[model samples]
Target: MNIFEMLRIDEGLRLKIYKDCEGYYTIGIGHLLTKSPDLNAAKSELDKAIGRNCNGVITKDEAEKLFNQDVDAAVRGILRNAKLKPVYDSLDAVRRCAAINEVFQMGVTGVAGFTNVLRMLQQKRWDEAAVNLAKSRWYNQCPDRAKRVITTFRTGTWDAYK
Candidate 1:
């Protein structure tokens, strides 16, 4: 496959997360209905209507039911699993980095290009520092949003996250 297909294939986690966001919003709207004027008790009615309208494929109403039944439970699950938050955070970071790289395929060569210079510094290979640094400077000066990940390389840690 080509680049576009590669994105869809490589971002299974991101894709699923996006779908979950859809579901969450659907459910959230349903829950919000419960607090809306003249629709508090109509939450179930709205859900059933959505489910029926979707012909059982997917119902915003059902999503709302799920949301009402388990939002706090989901938060509890997250709290119970400390490792899961880190994993999710790291996955989000990786996906963002990949997206930035894909957007700037020809600009500055992404963080890898930055790290190439860093690696040279680490290994004490300074013969072509001028050329490499020039390339780095050029990209850094480019008129686009470059991925801000070179800081991680400088710190020798994965700290380039929100």
Candidate 2:
């Protein structure tokens, strides 16, 4: 499956503004409205609605647009990383998807913090990488999200679809 399909499950497609786990105003597929270009870029009804109970609405098409943009950024962010480039290039298709998924959730810098996980991934140590990934704060904060990625990394299949 594609990254968008993966994200549809991992980050539910929300049409309205809501507070994510970090209490940041988020919309679409995990799009944060508080970020600089993010607030002004999408130009949605929620631009001025930062309150917890924001009632602003966003179009499905718009959300799709933003999601596609974010995914593009995520792919580029992973390829842009010097240390992650070779590791990412050595991965299989599903594992590559896992890498992009983690990057999408954690950002390049955040995923870069997982030293052990990265080290294991570089050696193609699937089990060890998954184990190390499970120990991360990202996993602790969003177990389901990290779980899906870890499973993809281990099985090299989109079992989440099954």
Point to the candidate with the largest TM-score: 2
Q: Write down the TM-score of every candidate.
A: 0.22, 0.84
In candidate 1, position 62 carries an lDDT of 54
- Return the TM-score for candidate 1, rounded to 2 decimals: 0.22
lDDT of 2 by residue, 1-162 (tens): 888888888888889777676556678998777643343333453654332233467679878878988899889988988877778898888899989999989888898778778878888789988887888888887686678888888888888656
On lDDT, the leading prediction is: 2
Which residue window of length 10 is worst by lDDT in model 2? 45-54
lDDT of 1 at 58: 40
Off by over 4 Å in 1: 1-138, 141-144
> Across residues 11-59, which tens digit of lDDT does each residue of candidate 1 receive?
2212011112122212222222233333323445444645443321344
